[PDB]
Design a protein around this ligand. Structure first.
Ligand code: CA
Ligand code: CA
Ligand code: CA
Ligand code: CA
Ligand code: CA
Lengths: 73, 146
């Protein structure tokens, strides 16, 4: 019975992390200033920006590329 | 036409935030220093993995051209539609092509690099176009990657 159950267990964490990184990549797009929650997340752990925002973007791009890699492994 | 003069300047400014010693390359140590100021605590291996994705010439660090290459790229140009759709499919256990907002929040806020409830709210609003509480994730991934 637990056929696809063990396989789900193996893929769930890299699947979630790819979705999360992909969303944070999408939601820090500078042409979508309505998307604020991912910035508020980072803001709650660092106070304004401006060049700090691009570095967050860089961190999000890199975390997405890594999580894409890990998902295909 | 993709990159403007002003965008390039912004990315050169960002590069200097990472390249602390000003030697033209970002090391794992320098990337670790930036991420700790952003609230994260990655391991050396995790830092290495991040650089490995950006370090085109394989010399172990990121130079400005490698940084600009990465930052000029849109998610649409990473050819990721199949992987991201496969990742959502993992959570569509029944396979009907929909994941409820409640299921997505449950997973996104309790597994992996947990999203805040606000971030999931933003994701749901972006994805659940028709407001029925069910996310058609194929349509969502299409829009994020096309
Ligand atoms: Ca340096
Ligand atoms: Ca390099
Ligand atoms: Ca379903
Ligand atoms: Ca819907
Ligand atoms: Ca479609």
């Amino acid at each position: 019975e637990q056929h696809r159950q063990k396989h789900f267990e193996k893929r769930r964490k890299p699947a979630a992390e790819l979705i999360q990184a992909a969303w944070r990549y999408y939601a820090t797009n500078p042409n979508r200033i309505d998307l604020v929650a991912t910035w508020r997340f980072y803001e709650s752990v660092v106070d304004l920006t401006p060049g700090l925002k691009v570095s967050i973007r860089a961190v999000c791009v890199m975390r997405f590329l890594v999580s894409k890699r890990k998902f295909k492994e | 036409d993709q990159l403007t003069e002003e965008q390039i300047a912004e990315f050169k400014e960002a590069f200097s935030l990472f390249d602390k010693d000003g030697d033209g390359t970002i090391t794992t140590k320098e990337l670790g220093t930036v991420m700790r100021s952003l609230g994260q605590n990655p391991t050396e291996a995790e830092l290495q993995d991040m650089i490995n994705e950006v370090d085109a010439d394989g010399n172990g660090t990121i130079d400005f051209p490698e940084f600009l290459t990465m930052m000029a790229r849109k998610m649409k140009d990473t050819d990721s539609e199949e992987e991201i759709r496969e990742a959502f499919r993992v959570f569509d256990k029944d396979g009907n092509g929909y994941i409820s907002a409640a299921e997505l929040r449950h997973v996104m806020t309790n597994l992996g690099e947990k999203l805040t409830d606000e971030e999931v709210d933003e994701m749901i609003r972006e994805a659940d176009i028709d407001g029925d509480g069910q996310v058609n994730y194929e349509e969502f991934v299409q829009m994020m990657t096309a």
